[PDB]
Structures are given as structure tokens and as C-alpha cells.
Amino acid sequence: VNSFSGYLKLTDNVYIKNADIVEEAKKVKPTVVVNAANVYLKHGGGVAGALNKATNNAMQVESDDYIATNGPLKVGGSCVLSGHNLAKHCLHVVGPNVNKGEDIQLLKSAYENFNQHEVLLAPLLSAGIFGADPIHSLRVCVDTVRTNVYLAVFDKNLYDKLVSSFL
Ligand SMILES: C[C@H]1CCN(c2ncnc3[nH]ccc23)[C@@H]1CO
DSSP states (O other): OOOOOSOEEOSSSEEEEEOOHHHHHHHHOOSEEEEEOOTTOOOOSHHHHHHHHHTTTHHHHHHHHHHHHHOOOOTTOEEEEEOTTTOSEEEEEOOOOGGGTOOTTHHHHHHHGGGGSSEEEEOOTTOGGGOOOHHHHHHHHHHHOOSEEEEEEOOHHHHHHHHHTOO
């Protein structure tokens, strides 16, 4: 039993809700919130910009030190950093950005990072400003993640469309 509320159960382990991931994380304080990161951890917009703003830019400060030490992530890769005031840990995961021409096949690799964590609050990877089809992202999530994932969907029409079209 955990403290996530109002989620529709899609499968044994995947749950979905129309919610603002920042407000969700602040309420639940999950062990892990997933960020829709880029390889440079430049949290400008989308989910990443929103989460970073909620940390008063502390996420960006921590991220800049991470990059200065380690260099960029790989597309499809991840790193674990602090969750600041939002969660214990933030798993920064780089899904392919279609608007940069990146290979959508790397989306499965991106979701595989979730399997290293028993429970996560997450967005749909490569959705929103990353330019992929959210229906496809949900399908890959369901077919890749085996741990318990609570998906927070910003767009209401999308949430309803994702639910009504879910196979
Ligand atoms: C619509 C896309 C882009 C934004 N994003 C979000 N999802 C959940 N909570 C959020 N809070 C702020 C942004 C955001 C979706 C990720 O596929």
C-alpha cells in the first residue's frame, strides 16, 4: 500500500491520472519522481522546467555540478540526483526528442531505467515538447516497465484519449 490517490489502474503495475506532476510530487513526496531530462540537464521547459522552478532552481544548480563532473547523459540514459523538496530522489531520464531528430526506438531504453526503482511518479517519456506520440509512449511504458509506475498526464484531452484508446 502506498499514498497515491485517484489513479486509474491500467495494468498490474501501471497507473494513470490527469495531474500536474509538480503538485503531485509535493503532495505525495514519493521516493522517486522522474524528470523528462535532456542530456545536458538543462531544465528549461516542459516537465523539467516545471520541476526545477518548484525547487527554486536548486535542481539546476545540482545538475550543473553533475554535468561539470560527468559530462552529458546518453539519449536513453538516466542519473539519480536529489528530489529536493519534491521527492527523495529525482531520476532524470532522457527520452528521445523527436524535434531534434532522435531515434524513437530509444524510448524503450529510456523506460528501462524505471525498472531500477520499485515505485515511481513519472511523466510519459518523450511526450509534450519532446514531440513523440503520447499513445505510443504509454504503450512502450506498459510493455517495458515492470516496477510500479504512477503516470501523471498534464493534458486533459490527452488523458481522456489515452484512457479511451488504451488496449
Ligand atoms: C504535455 C507534456 C509536456 C509537459 N508534460 C507534463 N506532464 C505532467 N506534469 C507536468 N507538469 C508540467 C509539465 C508536465 C507532458 C509530458 O509528456
